[PDB]
């Protein structure tokens, strides 16, 4: 639901 | 279990008007997410808790970030893009009232008590570790993480600043001013969303869900 | 001089929303009486006295009714004797802000066993807001503010030893208190705007 | 500002 935040938290 | 040296190592690890502030806020959000990972035990948390924590307190983790870096600027704010926004430019854009509040309740107080990046770092961690956020899976761990932060902050103050016994309280008493500013800063950003006059970049749109 | 004893003395002295508004207006009188018994309050210029009270009524009343309700872990105990329950507030359209109060204040104060002295100190800290625009002298206000939490850490460390972070735990309810306090303003401002919700005389003077 | 003023005397 929060695309840019989930993607920025994993890496 | 939650040292101030690791927390300070996080603050240092990360370094017309309204439109510029919305660009600066967007780019600063990418920097907030990387500040949070370097905060002890934040990444051990469920990924759905990490989302809830940052997404509930960015409006005032950012305000604290720009407030403290603006201690040097007189009657103005230094943005994360290196651009200064002056109080005169603020009123001109129609957002003079809230700008004045940041200059008075935030920048001015961090200046008069000479707040350092360690105190700022713990104050921000206390803001990040807020177990009152809606939807958390385990508020107790978040509360116990918050308790570890200000228990470490009280010690840093007692050892570094023994000439100011109430230095611990003066820091915590800046958190209510922040919740106030951050909320009024959303109530503005949200209005800038409806009309569509201000370009709002990708990341900032998402937070303004 | 801010003896923690005198602050404890000051504290010791249909439509659900309409019943909540009748009670807010009534307690505003009591608030004004509470502040007068705060050490060195009545000695201020009424220019400042009015500003301190017109900048914290939503927050001083929120704290008061919250502490009354630590006994009823269901809803809110109002100053008039009526209990407003979660269902009445939800069924009347104020469930969102009403759940925060129970969650962020009423239940937090229950779990840490906050007493009537720490509440009087915390309300007195809210009262002496030096950040209130137009104060004649914000320095004297903050002078009184520092005198207060000084008497509270001392009271915490002696009455509640082996709890070093209880004095900080108390102060970390002031941000929540303000978050709620401003939400009731916006809520109250809205009820006045729509104009089909009764509001008493004193509650309007406090809404400008 | 009447009732607030009066209530203080
Ligand atoms: C309302 C408006 C435009 C004017 C008042 C100020 C300048 C404080 C402000 C601050 C924010 C901000 C913000 C914080 C930091 C930065 C930065 O450092 O780049 C940029 C923006 O967004 C979230 C909270 O604070 C948003 C909007 C406004
Ligand atoms: C928003 C609405 C109607 C519902 C949610 C709650 C119960 C928090 C609430 C509280 C207030 C109040 C208030 C506080 C105490 C009392 C009382 O003592 O009976 C009465 C009212 O108004 C000043 C601040 O809190 C006002 C409105 C609302």
The DSSP secondary structure of C120-150, one letter per residue, reads: HHHHHHHHS-TTSTT-S-HHHHHHHHHHHHH
CA distance linking residue C43 with residue C53, whole number of Å: 14
- Structure-token pair, residue B209: 């869900």
- Choose among D1, D2, D7: nearest Cβ to C32: D7
Contacts of C57 (CB under 8 A, 6+ apart): C28, C31, C206
Nearest to B146 by CA among B42, B14, B9: B42
Query: Hey, what long-range contacts does C177-180 have (CB within 8 A, 24 or more apart)?
Result: C177/B176, C177/C59, C177/C62, C177/C63, C177/C105, C177/C126, C178/B176, C178/B179, C178/B180, C178/C59, C179/B179, C179/B183, C179/C100, C179/C104, C180/C59, C180/C62, C180/C97, C180/C100, C180/C101, C180/C104, C180/C105
Inter-chain residue contact B206 with A8, CB threshold 8 Å: no
d(CA C158, CA C154): 6
Preferred mutation among A9, A10, A11 to probe B, highest tally of B CBs within 10 A: A9
Q: Which of B18, B63, B93 to mutate to test the pocket of ligand 1 (most atoms within 8 A of CB)?
A: B63
Q: Are the beta carbons of D7 and C29 separated by less than 8 Å?
A: yes
Q: Which of C187, C200, C172, C201 is nearest to C58 (CA)?
A: C187
Does residue B185 have its Cβ closer than 6 Å to ligand 1?
yes
Q: Are B4 and B152 in contact (CB under 8 A)?
A: yes
DSSP class of residue D9 equals -
Chains in contact with A, where contact means 3 or more Cβ–Cβ distances below 8 Å, are: B
Instruction: Point out the ligand nearest to the CA of residue B84.
Output: 1
The owner of tokens 């998402």 is: B206
- Measured from the Cα of C57, ligand 2's closest atom is 23
In whole angstroms, give the CA distance from residue B207 to residue C19. Answer: 37
Single out the residue of C171, C153, C141 nearest to residue C41, CA to CA.
Answer: C141
Alpha-carbon distance values, B163 to B159, B166, B168, C25 (Å) = 10, 9, 12, 45
- Establish if C165 touches chain B: CB-CB under 8 angstroms: yes
Task: For chain C, give the number of residues.
Answer: 208
Give the integer Cα–Cα distance in Å for C34 and C44: 15
Cβ of C44 closer than 6 Å to ligand 2, yes or no, is no
Q: How far apart are CA C28 and CA B184, in angstroms?
A: 25
Domain boundaries, chain B: 1-209
CA distance, residue B7 to nearest chain C CA (Å): 19
Please name the chains neighbouring B, where neighbouring means 3+ C-beta pairs under 8 angstroms: A, C
D5 near C CB under 8 A: yes
Is the CB of residue D2 less than 8 Å away from at least one CB of chain C? yes
Solved by what technique?
X-ray
- Nearest ligand 2 atom to the CA of C101 is 8
Q: Which helix (DSSP H) or strand (DSSP E) does residue C85 occupy?
A: strand C83-85
Strand (E) or helix (H) holding C75: strand C75-77
> Which residue's CA is minimally distant from atom 28 of ligand 2?
C184
8 A C-beta contact, residue B101 and residue B185 = no
C65 lines ligand 2 (CB under 6 A): yes
Residue B59 backbone zone (phi > 0: left; psi -120 to 50: alpha; other: beta): alpha
Among A4, A6, A9, the residue with its CB nearest the CB of B203 is A4
What is the distance between the alpha carbons of residues C199 and B141, in angstroms, rounded to a whole number? 43
For residues B125 and B8, what is the distance between their CA atoms, to the nearest angstrom?
10
User: Chains with 3 or more CB pairs closer than 8 angstroms to D?
Assistant: C
- Please give the resolution of this entry in Å, rounded to 1 decimal: 3.3
* B132 vs C: CB within 8 A: yes
Which atom of ligand 2 lies nearest, measured to the CA of C80?
A: 19
């Amino acid at each position: 639901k929060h695309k840019i935040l989930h993607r920025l938290l994993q890496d | 279990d939650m040292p101030v040296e690791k927390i300070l190592e996080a603050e240092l690890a990360v370094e017309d008007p309204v439109t510029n502030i919305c660009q600066a806020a967007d780019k600063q959000l990418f920097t907030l997410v990387e500040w949070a990972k370097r905060i002890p035990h934040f990444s051990e948390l469920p990924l759905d808790d990490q989302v809830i924590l940052l997404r509930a307190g960015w409006n005032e983790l950012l305000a604290a970030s720009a407030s403290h870096r603006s201690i040097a600027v007189k009657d103005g704010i230094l943005l994360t893009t290196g651009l200064h926004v002056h109080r005169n430019s603020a009123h001109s854009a129609g957002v003079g009232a809230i700008f004045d509040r940041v200059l008075t309740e935030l920048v001015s107080k961090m200046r008069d008590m000479q707040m350092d990046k360690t105190e700022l770092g713990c104050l921000r961690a206390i803001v990040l570790f807020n177990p009152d956020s809606k939807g958390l899976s385990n508020p107790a761990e978040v509360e116990a993480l918050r308790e570890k932060v200000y228990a470490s902050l009280e010690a840093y103050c007692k050892h570094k600043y023994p000439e100011q016994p109430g230095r611990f309280a003066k820091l915590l008493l800046r958190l209510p001013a922040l919740r106030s500013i951050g909320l009024k800063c959303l109530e503005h950003l949200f209005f800038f969303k409806l009309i569509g006059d201000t370009p709002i970049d990708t990341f900032l749109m998402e937070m303004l869900e």
